[PDB]
Amino acid sequence: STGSATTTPIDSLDDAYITPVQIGTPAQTLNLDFDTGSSDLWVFSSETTASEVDGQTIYTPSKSTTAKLLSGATWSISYGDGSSSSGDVYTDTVSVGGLTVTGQAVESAKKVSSSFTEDSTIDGLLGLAFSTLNTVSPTQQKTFFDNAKASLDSPVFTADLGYHAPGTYNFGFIDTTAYTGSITYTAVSTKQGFWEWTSTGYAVGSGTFKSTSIDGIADTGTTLLYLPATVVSAYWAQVSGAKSSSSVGGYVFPCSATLPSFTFGVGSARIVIPGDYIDFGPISTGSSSCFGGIQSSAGIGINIFGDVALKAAFVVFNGATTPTLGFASK
Numbered sequence: 001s002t003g004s005a006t007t008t009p010i011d012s013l014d015d016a017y018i019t020p021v022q023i024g025t026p027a028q029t030l031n032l033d034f035d036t037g038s039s040d041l042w043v044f045s046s047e048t049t050a051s052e053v054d055g056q057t058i059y060t061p062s063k064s065t066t067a068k069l070l071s072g073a074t075w076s077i078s079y080g081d082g083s084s085s086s087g088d089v090y091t092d093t094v095s096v097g098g099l100t101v102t103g104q105a106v107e108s109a110k111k112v113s114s115s116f117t118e119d120s121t122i123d124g125l126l127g128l129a130f131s132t133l134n135t136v137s138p139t140q141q142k143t144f145f146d147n148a149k150a151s152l153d154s155p156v157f158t159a160d161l162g163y164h165a166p167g168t169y170n171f172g173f174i175d176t177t178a179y180t181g182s183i184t185y186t187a188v189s190t191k192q193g194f195w196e197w198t199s200t201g202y203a204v205g206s207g208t209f210k211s212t213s214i215d216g217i218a219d220t221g222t223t224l225l226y227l228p229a230t231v232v233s234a235y236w237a238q239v240s241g242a243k244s245s246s247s248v249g250g251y252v253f254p255c256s257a258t259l260p261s262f263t264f265g266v267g268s269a270r271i272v273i274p275g276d277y278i279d280f281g282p283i284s285t286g287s288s289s290c291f292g293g294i295q296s297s298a299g300i301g302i303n304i305f306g307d308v309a310l311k312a313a314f315v316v317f318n319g320a321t322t323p324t325l326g327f328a329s330k
Contacts, residue, residue, distance in 0.1 A: 001151045002172035003099025007034065009164065010121040013280050014307060015223050017161060018122060019169055022095040023106055024064030030057050030123035034169055035221030036159070036195050036317060037304075039133035039143050040077050041094070042085055042107035043124035044116075052112050055120025061108065067092045075107045075136045080222065080300065083115040089136055094144060096126075099171050101148050105134075105141035125221070128157065128317065133193035145171070145319060155319045159220055160330070161311035163277055179314035179328035184269035188323040192302075194219070195317060197325050199305075200267060202227075204235050205260030209270070214303055218315060218325055222306030224280070225262070225273070226297035235262055235294050242292070248283050251292035255282060262294060264309060266327040273312045 007019040018031035023043065030043055044056040061067040067090050076086035087110035094104040109124070116122065127134070131142045149155045152172030160168040160178055168178070189196045199214040214227065232251065236242040238260050242253035253259070259275030278293035293308040316326030 001099055001148070002153055002170070003095075003097035003148075004168065004170050005097030006166050007161065007169055008166045009162070010119070012164070014161075014164060014311065016119075016122060017167070017220070017307070019096070019126070021126060023059055024061070024092050025066040026064075027095070028057075028059055028064065030059060031121065032124045032126040033122050033221060034128055034159075035125050035219070036128045037217060037219035037221045038077065038079065038125060039127040039129045039131055039193065040075060040107050040135055041105065041124070041126045041144055042075065042077070042087070042109055044112070045087070045108040047087060048109045049111055052117045054117050057123045059106065059108065059124075061090045061092070061106075064092055066102075067106075070105065070136075070139075070141075073105075073136050073139060073141075077135045080304075081115070083113045085109045085112040085116060087111065089141070096144065096171065097169070099148055099152075101144055104144055104147055105136060107136065107141075128220070129195065130190050130193045132190070145317075148172070149319055157317050157319070159310060159315045159317065161220065161307055163274075163311050167311070174316060179330040181329055182269075183314070183316060183326040183328040184266045185316070185318070185324045185326040186266050188325055190323060192217075194302075195323070195325055200265030202231055202265065203263040203270075204238050205275075207238075209263065209265070211265070214264075216303030216305045218305050218310060218317070220307060220310060222304045223308070224304075224306050225278075225294045225308040226300055226304040226306065227294065228303065229296045229298045232294055232296045235260070236292065244296075248289070248291070250295045252283060252289045253292055255288045255290040257290070264305075269327065271309070271313045271327055271329060273309060277308055277312060
């Protein structure tokens with residue numbers, strides 16, 4: 001089997017991407033944030049505290065003939081941005097882009113933090129990291145990809161995120177028309193539960209490539225690119241007037257600037273992030289100070305190849321017995 005779904009930016013900044021997901025019988029379509037940095041599929045639901053729902057589409061298990069309460073199971077998750085959610089668990093039929101999994105754990109939110117309530121466009125998350133991170137207790141549950149894997153033509157999924165435009169998540173095949181040149185594959189460590197890999201270096205604009213190992217995770221659920229302070233400083237030093245602002249929470253730059261590209265290494269290959277991808281616009285409406293798309297990972301504890309980086313590439317998440325990651329230009 002295979003699946004193919006379009007993913008769509010939630011706003012003009014590509015702050016996140018949503019992908020339609022069918023849950024239940026008859027289908028209940030929710031728009032979920034596919035997150036290769038977590039491993040819970042959770043949704044806004046009929047069980048979610050009423051005051052914490054504001055515009056989202058909810059899953060109603062009682063209207064699904066294939067829904068079954070997973071007795072005794074609860075879940076609770078906190079994300080890197082400080083947001084959180086929790087609730088109980090159903091099993092139900094879940095389909096993505098024509099690919100169907102029966103008995104998928106669907107984690108029904110009883111509580112969500114403000115950040116989720118305030119974002120009317122995201123109805124939940126679908127995690128695509130390794131199932132060892134799944135928070136369901138007392139019986140840990142598998143991700144959608146884990147459940148689908150054995151049935152897929154090839155045990156892979158691909159992320160093809162657009163810049164200010166729709167893109168595609170494919171399951172079970174590699175669309176050879178969707179990228180240019182070759183796919184360069186690189187080793188993955190699953191030790192922390194993530195799609196963790198080591199970049200071979202970086203360049204700023206038309207500058208020379210610095211060979212240096214950067215360990216990080218491929219995380220579709222994180223908006224920006226978080227790298228070591230040394231790297232980030234070298235980038236923003238090439239932008240007149242750029243500075244790190246503690247009051248804003250990172251590097252800002254004059255909105256009148258032309259941003260340089262940023263290149264990262266994948267083995268001997270190079271992925272180029274155009275300067276425009278690194279612009280996240282005014283810090284507040286009408287401001288002439290703009291927020292940077294490359295930020296320091298210092299105090300996150302991990303480097304994160306988020307959407308700013310991934311959308312510059314066609315990315316293969318290879319879930320073979322020994323997982324790998326592939327990157328191609330497109």
